[PDB]
Amino acid sequence: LAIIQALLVKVNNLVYAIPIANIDTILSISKEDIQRVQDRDVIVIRGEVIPVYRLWEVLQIEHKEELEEMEAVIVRVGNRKYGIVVDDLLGQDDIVIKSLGKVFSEVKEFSGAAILGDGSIALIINVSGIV
Amino acid sequence: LAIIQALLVKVNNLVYAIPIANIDTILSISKEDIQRVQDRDVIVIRGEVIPVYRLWEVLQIEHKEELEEMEAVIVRVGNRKYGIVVDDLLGQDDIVIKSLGKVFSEVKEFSGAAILGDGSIALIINVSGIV
Amino acid sequence: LAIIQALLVKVNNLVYAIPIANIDTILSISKEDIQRVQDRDVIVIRGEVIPVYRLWEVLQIEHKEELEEMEAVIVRVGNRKYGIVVDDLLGQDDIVIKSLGKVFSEVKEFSGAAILGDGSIALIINVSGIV
Amino acid sequence: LKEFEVLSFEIDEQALAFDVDNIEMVIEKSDITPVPKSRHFVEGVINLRGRIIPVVNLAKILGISFDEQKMKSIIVARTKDVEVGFLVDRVLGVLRITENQLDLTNVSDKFGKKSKGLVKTDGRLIIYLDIDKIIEEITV
Amino acid sequence: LKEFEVLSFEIDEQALAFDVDNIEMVIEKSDITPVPKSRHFVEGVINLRGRIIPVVNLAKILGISFDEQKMKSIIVARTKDVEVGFLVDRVLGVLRITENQLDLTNVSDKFGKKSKGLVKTDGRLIIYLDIDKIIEEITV
Amino acid sequence: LKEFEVLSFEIDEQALAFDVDNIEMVIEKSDITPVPKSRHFVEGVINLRGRIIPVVNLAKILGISFDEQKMKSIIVARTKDVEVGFLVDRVLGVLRITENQLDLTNVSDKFGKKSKGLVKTDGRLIIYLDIDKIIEEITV
């Protein structure tokens, strides 16, 4: 079996799993200090410029309550790293990657699903496929 | 002259002439037992599956009163036959096919017009041009 | 310097300059005797058929009060001549053609601007570029 | 020159005419039978003297504006074998003309070869139409 | 001939069926997890017997109409390695059939090779679907 | 390195700057004469020191958002022969900089070669614009 440790994260009631191997850190940013750069939004932390992506916007999920303080996973693809705002920080966990089959062949945003403890589903974010 | 015997049929106030040479029978079907097959509607009579076409829909004519019992001419093109629902069953008649000229060159749905007794017009259905 | 004498003309509050070298005459036409020809409007004066163009329509400028009597400059491009209705007939004047630069490279309707007495701008109509 | 006879009519605020040799008769728009699934500018067929004649909307063919309430006349013309009824507002009368009161100013390019020129009468314009070229266009 | 067993179901006013050898089980539509940014006809994935199975809207795949309130059943079928849940209104039962009560009239071309023919039962039509060809279509 | 002087301004919630050597002067948006049938991003021409200068909407050229009520300043810059007034919200001041506080992270590709990089000042970003390349783009 293919085990992998991952951060369980939430958008509304949906569960996404970001493999821990890709997380750089986890901060709590405040609307107050996001900056508009061109078409993208960034935070700068310790002089490092990191573009932030809301996860619901990245996945096109209906959602509105954009709070003043929000939790955000920073991930890293090669040598560029970038933020991912989420709703809830569920917890760290050990999951078994199952493939979600031939009908999702084209979905670059994910890389498989996991069945959790209570038998609910999490889909695994493919960090190098979320722009 | 080119005489031809034909069923005179009505949609609202318009008169269409179906050459009798092409009619197979004339039944009275009831909404109750039309069946949806794919995108087409059919009746099955004596195990024979016949697709029905409303004549106003085939000709795009405004019309709404789709009664529970309706009269329908079954016609035959080669070896496939198919129904044609109409409003009124005017009567059988002997008409002279006149050509409706060079400006209707493209209209596959008809094959000429007739001048009736009272000098009103009927257009002759071209059964092999009504899909 | 490039001096040129020109008719100063108005549409709403905007000032356009038609070089006098291109004017044939200046009449006052009345809605009453414009004639629709195909898609174009014409007046006929002394058996001569002259298409009239409203200047605001030619330049797409918001404007509505199309009075019953209106003032119109007739201009001449080669051997065809044509009318140009305007709002006000400001006056004849001597202006210095200045080029309106590289960002207007494509605007066929004009051929430069002038700075007037009070330092306001007039743009010079290019009669052979107003259809 | 040569003496020309034409029929002048009106399609709302705009006056036109074609060569009288092609007209059979001018009847009143009474009753027209639709011919489903035909071009947008054909109105239908009429029964006239026991023959089928297609009636078309001349305004729609030329591309000028018209008001349906006013389409009251049908000019029935023919070229060679083909016969056609053109629906217009009102007939105005016959005009006797000469190819020298025939102004050829290029006011527009809209009507293609359908236009033959302007005819100035008291300084009042009338478009001279090439009836054959209209029928040619309208067939195949 | 040959004896055929098929599963008949309804997608609103229209009755269909596929070969019973391909069905694993028919469960009740309970709970489906969306898979963002996937094709329009996939509803999502479900957890069934500890495995991930995609659930698709059969109506959307065929192109016939459906009412969401009524999509209550999931037929879980498989061909070769690929396993899929088709969302339908209601299962109607099993039918035992023979390729001679299998009417092949060409009523329409909409369902491509997805259709295998009509089955007439008491003069009451049921479309026989090629389940493999539906799955083949739906994968790559 | 090298010492760089730039002019920083704001187009609503977003701060930008270009090389000070190209600026002639910063005037207040007063009065602009429209030039009909010109590109969507040109506002028009102004009379400044007895010469004609085109004024363009920098936001529209870059593609960022702006509020018309706030476009209050005009930065008049020139490259070679071509002179242009860029309409912005407010000027913020001059900044003295060095190509090593010049962050080149690839945050986006929207501004093409119009962008020269970020300048971090107290951890507060400002986009450094290539003024020449903006003018080059805007001419032919």
From Swiss-Prot, chains A, B, C:
Role this protein plays: Involved in the transmission of sensory signals from the chemoreceptors to the flagellar motors. CheA is autophosphorylated; it can transfer its phosphate group to either CheB or CheY.
Protein name: Chemotaxis protein CheA
Natural source organism: Thermotoga maritima (strain ATCC 43589 / DSM 3109 / JCM 10099 / NBRC 100826 / MSB8)
Subcellular location: Cytoplasm
Residues of the CheW-like domain: 3-131
Domain of life: Bacteria
UniProtKB/Swiss-Prot annotation, chains D, E, F:
PROSITE patterns with a match to the protein in the record: CHEW
Chief location of this protein within or outside the cell: cytoplasm
Alphabetic keyword roster: Chemotaxis, Cytoplasm
Record's keyword annotation contains Transmembrane helix: no
Pfam families: CheW
Residue ranges constituting the CheW-like domain according to the UniProt record: 3-140
Gene3D superfamilies referenced in this protein's UniProt entry, alphabetically: CheA-289, Domain 4, SH3 Domains
A GO MF term: protein domain specific binding
InterPro entries given in the database record: CheW, CheW-like_dom_sf, CheW-lke_dom
SUPFAM superfamilies membership: CheW-like
Compartments, record wording: Cytoplasm
A single Gene Ontology CC term: cytosol
Transmembrane segments: none
BP GO annotations: chemotaxis; signal transduction
Chain's role: Involved in the transmission of sensory signals from the chemoreceptors to the flagellar motors.
PANTHER family: CHEMOTAXIS PROTEIN CHEW (PTHR22617:SF23), CHEMOTAXIS SENSOR HISTIDINE KINASE-RELATED (PTHR22617)
Name of the featured protein: Chemotaxis protein CheW
Gene: cheW
